[PDB]
Amino acid sequence: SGRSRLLEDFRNQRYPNLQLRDLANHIVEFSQDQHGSRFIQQKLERATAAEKQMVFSEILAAAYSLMTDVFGNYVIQKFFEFGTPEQKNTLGMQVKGHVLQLALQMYGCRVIQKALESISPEQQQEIVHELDGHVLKCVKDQNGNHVVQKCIECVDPVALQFIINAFKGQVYSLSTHPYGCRVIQRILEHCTAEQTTPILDELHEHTEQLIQDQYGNYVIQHVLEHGKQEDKSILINSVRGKVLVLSQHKFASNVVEKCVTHATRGERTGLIDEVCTFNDNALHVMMKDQYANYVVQKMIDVSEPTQLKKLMTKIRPHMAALRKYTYGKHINAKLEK
RNA sequence: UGUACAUA
């Protein structure tokens, strides 16, 4: 069966001045339609509390089905953003008992995220309690991980301890997971020092593997860009002596750049001198490499003058030849700009 | 000249 006459006429531009009240008895049908849903979304704000209640009445009967609908989920979200406190509370009761199922659903997870941004701390903690015992399942889920991230962003850290507890012994597995690595970073941004300490401790049991992992390299870079000095120095200690090799790696080259950027003055001198203070060809190998040439350029940018002079002494003899090299030519281009 | 992060 197909679209009602009213919906089809609306879609064919037959009612260019249509209003919400004209949709009586067809609100759910419009909400399940791409264009009908956009119409409701656009009209809900600027509408009168009386208009919203007729809309709210019809969706409420079908609230759960709309939360998981490709087009209806936006209408539910619109009531979390523009509804009265009572409407928001009534929607919370429709979510109650279904948080996990919605969090794992590709459209339901959008409703849960919007709710978390839109409701009181008390109402947030009702939602979070339903994820206790299902943390790892949600974190490793393509929809659920976004709900867990949003909880960490928006909810009092005290109520998040169950996530920290569930992550014990799982930090390497999650930091190397396409979805888990996102949640680890949210934890490092938003959780308390007592919560991040066991995460960081466990992280540091796996530094060398994480640095060269497809997803773990982002977690390591996060700590270098945002973490405490003590943790940055631990990380830098897994890179010293390894600059040449790691700079040639697609993933780890980015870690090397963050090490030289966020190091202390002395650590940065140590890492840069490793590849230019000895009489070896490390810097030349790096300049010609598809990834390490970016590391050389970063070292040029962050080097204090003493180290810049040392780099330039290694570079200058190769300048004329570098212009023909696929990646090396970018060193010459930088220095000739 | 270089890697993740989702709806019409």
Residue numbers in the entry: 1090 to 1426
Article excerpt on this structure:
Pum is a founding member of the Pum/fem-3 mRNA-binding factor (FBF), or PUF family, of eukaryotic RBPs. Pum binds with high affinity to specific sequences in target mRNAs and represses protein expression and enhances mRNA degradation. Here, we report the crystal structures of Nos-Pum-RNA complexes, which reveal that Nos acts as a molecular clamp that embraces both Pum and RNA.
For example, the UGU motif of the PRE is recognized by repeats R8 through R6. With these conformational changes, Pum and Nos interact with one another and together recognize RNA immediately 5´ of the core PRE motif. Pum binds to the hb PRE2 using the base-omission mode observed for human Pumilio1, where bases +4 and +5 stack directly. Pum binds specifically to the 3´ AUA sequence at positions +6 to +8 of hb PRE2 RNA.
